[PDB]
């Protein structure tokens, strides 16, 4: 992970959307790390059988996924709970159409990954928010506010765990308190756990559906190798739905939308990601966590005008620019014109995103060093 690899001219959204060669790109959430070599090998092998017609899932894929949830989170699942989706944003949309009617209520907790909002409002459901509470280097759930929203008749809650963009890995105690509110008010939960496998040394990912049979009965769990293994462009996702009635409604929507399984390389890459890549995974968790610690230290020492939220997992870094007292336009201009860095503006993540930025730390230390140098320069 130490050596920079050129992504210019690979049709990378991150690196090939802006033509200006002096810009460094740390916005969209993929990594400037090479994929594990066993995934490259598995792909090379499949290309050596030069027919690419309709394919079913590999015969062992269910067992591979069952062993993955058991190994990673000590979660025992059934093969029949597994549904595929070509990405997690489609699974959010499928869930909204499956478990709510038009003008019924869906709750999210900003600041949040923007398709959480967009998929609710574009499907003509009513959007409710329970904004997270900034507290120190971190964020908590305001359970009193959330309960007040649940009392208004919420059908569905989209949970982000770990939460993009702030990097919170929810504790077992936080998820149980959430779980008891979902039971109390009979709320169905979509648990977007796409960030579940990049977790820092002092934290543990608890699948919400793993806490009890009661919570398994009411939860749609969204996972993937996309973020973990930098294969998002292959569109491989896994939806785990323990409740046969919820699973039948979900797969009904997929069916009426003409969905009939993943592309060939999604299955090939997922098969390798979840069997042959454990060492690469251990090493990238250590590398990314050290990157997060270096970034927090660098900003604390050299850009005291900024406040960092300490991430507990994933490779995204959430930064409060409040005390610079800049307009979004003025701050973006400085970053682009003076910094020459492209980072995510926080205002797109809804309430709590005002005057924040999100920088991608899923890159070699030497690149992160340059990003942080340019960030210091930008606000000097």
Ligand X SMILES: Cc1ncc(COP(=O)(O)O)c(C=O)c1O
Omega of the bond leading into 368 within 30 degrees of 0 (cis): no
Q: Which is nearer to a copy of itself, 199 or 234 (CB)?
A: 234
CB-based contact 354:347 (threshold 8 Å): yes
Residue 114 binding: pick among ligand X, a copy of itself, none (C-beta 5-8 Å cut-off by kind): none
Place of tokens 């690979």: 10
Cβ atoms within 10 Å, residue 136: 9
Q: Is 227 annotated as a binding residue?
A: yes
CB-based contact 265:46 (threshold 8 Å): yes
At closest approach, how far in Å is the CB of 365 from ligand X?
A: 22
DSSP assignment of 125-192, as one string? Answer: PEEEE---EEETTEEE--HHHHHHHHTTT--EEEEESSBTTTTB---HHHHHHHHHHHHHTT-EEEEE
Instruction: Decide: is 122 part of the binding site for a copy of itself (CB under 8 A).
Output: yes
Residue 192 binding: pick among ligand X, a copy of itself, none (C-beta 5-8 Å cut-off by kind): ligand X
Q: Is 96 annotated as a binding residue?
A: no
Q: Is 240 annotated as a binding residue?
A: no
At closest approach, how far in Å is the CB of 231 from a copy of itself?
A: 4
Q: Which is nearer to a copy of itself, 4 or 140 (CB)?
A: 4
Q: Which is nearer to ligand X, 62 or 114 (CB)?
A: 114
* Site for ligand X, residues 92 to 121, rule: CB under 6 A: 113
* Cα 58 from chain centre: 26
Please write down the long-range contacts of 63-70, taking CB distance under 8 Å and 24 or more positions apart.
64/270, 64/271, 64/274, 64/275, 65/238, 65/274, 67/274, 68/274, 69/207, 69/240
| Binding region for ligand X (CB under 6 A) out of 84-92, 209-217, 272-280, 328-336 | 84-92
Quick one: which of 175, 191, 223, 232 contacts ligand X (CB under 6 A)? 232
Query: Would you say how long the chain is, in residues?
Result: 380
Residue nearest to ligand X (CB): 87
Quick one: which of 53, 245, 327, 329 contacts a copy of itself (CB under 8 A)? 53
Instruction: Decide: is 90 part of the binding site for a copy of itself (CB under 8 A).
Output: yes
Quick one: which of 2, 3, 56, 173 contacts a copy of itself (CB under 8 A)? 56
- Residue 368 CA to residue 24 CA, distance in Å, equals 10
Place of tokens 């896994």: 238
Quick one: which of 65, 83, 91, 342 contacts a copy of itself (CB under 8 A)? 91
275: its two tokens: 């069997």
- Residue 72 CA to residue 49 CA, distance in Å, equals 32
Quick one: which of 230, 309, 314, 378 contacts a copy of itself (CB under 8 A)? 230
Residue 315 binding: pick among ligand X, a copy of itself, none (C-beta 5-8 Å cut-off by kind): none
Please write down the long-range contacts of 336-340, taking CB distance under 8 Å and 24 or more positions apart.
336/23, 338/377, 338/378, 339/374, 339/375, 339/377, 339/378, 340/20, 340/22, 340/23, 340/24, 340/374
Residue 256 binding: pick among ligand X, a copy of itself, none (C-beta 5-8 Å cut-off by kind): a copy of itself
Residue 317 binding: pick among ligand X, a copy of itself, none (C-beta 5-8 Å cut-off by kind): none
At closest approach, how far in Å is the CB of 51 from a copy of itself?
A: 6
CB-based contact 157:116 (threshold 8 Å): no
* Site for ligand X, residues 156 to 215, rule: CB under 6 A: 160, 164, 192, 194
Q: Which is nearer to ligand X, 87 or 311 (CB)?
A: 87
31: its two tokens: 């990594």
- Residue 60 CA to residue 70 CA, distance in Å, equals 16
Instruction: Write each residue from 310 to 349 as x if it is in contact with a copy of itself (CB under 8 A), else as -, in one continuous string.
Output: ----------------------------------------
333: its two tokens: 């201009």
Any residues with CB less than 8 A from the CB of 16 and at least 6 apart, and which? 7, 8, 9, 10
> What element of type H or E holds 317?
strand 316-320
**Residue ranges in contact with ligand X by CB under 6 A:** 29, 87-89, 113, 160, 164, 192, 194, 224, 226, 232, 237
Binding residues for pyridoxal 5'-phosphate: 54, 88-89, 113, 164, 227, 260
**Residue ranges in contact with a copy of itself by CB under 8 A:** 5, 7, 10-14, 16-17, 28-35, 37, 39-40, 43-44, 47, 49-59, 86-87, 89-94, 115, 118-119, 122-123, 230-235, 252, 255-260, 263-267, 269
């Amino acid at each position: 992970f130490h050596k920079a690899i050129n992504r210019r001219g690979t049709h990378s959204i991150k690196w090939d959307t802006y033509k200006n060669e002096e810009l460094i790109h740390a916005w969209i959430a993929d990594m400037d790390f090479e994929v594990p070599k066993p995934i490259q090998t598995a792909l090379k092998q499949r290309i050596e059988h030069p027919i690419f017609g309709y394919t079913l899932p590999p015969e062992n894929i269910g067992n591979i996924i069952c062993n993955w949830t058991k190994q990673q989170y000590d979660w025992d699942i059934q093969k029949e709970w597994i549904v595929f989706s070509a990405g997690i944003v489609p699974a959010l949309s499928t869930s909204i159409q499956a478990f709510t009617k038009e003008n019924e209520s869906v709750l999210v907790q900003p600041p949040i990954y923007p398709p959480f909002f967009e998929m609710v409002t574009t499907n003509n459901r009513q959007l409710y928010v329970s904004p997270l509470q900034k507290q120190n280097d971190t964020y908590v759930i305001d359970f009193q506010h959330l309960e007040k929203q649940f009392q208004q008749g919420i059908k569905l809650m989209l949970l982000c765990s770990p939460h993009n963009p702030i990097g919170r890995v929810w504790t077992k105690e936080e998820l149980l308190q959430l779980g008891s509110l979902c039971t109390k008010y009979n709320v169905i939960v979509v648990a977007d756990e796409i960030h579940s496998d990049i977790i820092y040394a002092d934290h543990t990912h608890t699948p919400f559906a793993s806490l009890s049979e009661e919570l398994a009965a009411r939860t749609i769990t969204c996972m993937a190798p996309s973020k973990t293994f930098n294969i998002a462009g292959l569109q491989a996702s896994i939806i785990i739905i323990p409740n046969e009635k919820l699973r039948q409604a979900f797969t009904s929507i997929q069916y009426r939308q003409g969905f009939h399984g993943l592309n060939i390389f999604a299955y090939t890459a997922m098969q390798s990601a979840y069997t042959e890549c454990n060492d690469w995974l251990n090493e990238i968790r250590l590398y990314i966590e050290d990157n997060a610690q270096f970034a927090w230290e660098y900003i604390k020492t050299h850009i005291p005008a900024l406040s960092v939220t300490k991430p507990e997992g994933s490779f995204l870094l959430w930064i409060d620019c409040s005390r610079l007292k800049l307009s979004q336009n003025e701050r973006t201009a400085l970053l682009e014109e003076k910094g020459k860095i492209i980072v995510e503006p926080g205002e797109k993540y809804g309430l709590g995103g005002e005057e924040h930025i999100r920088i991608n730390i899923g890159c070699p230390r030497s690149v992160l060093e340059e990003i942080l140098n340019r960030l210091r320069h930008t606000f000097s």
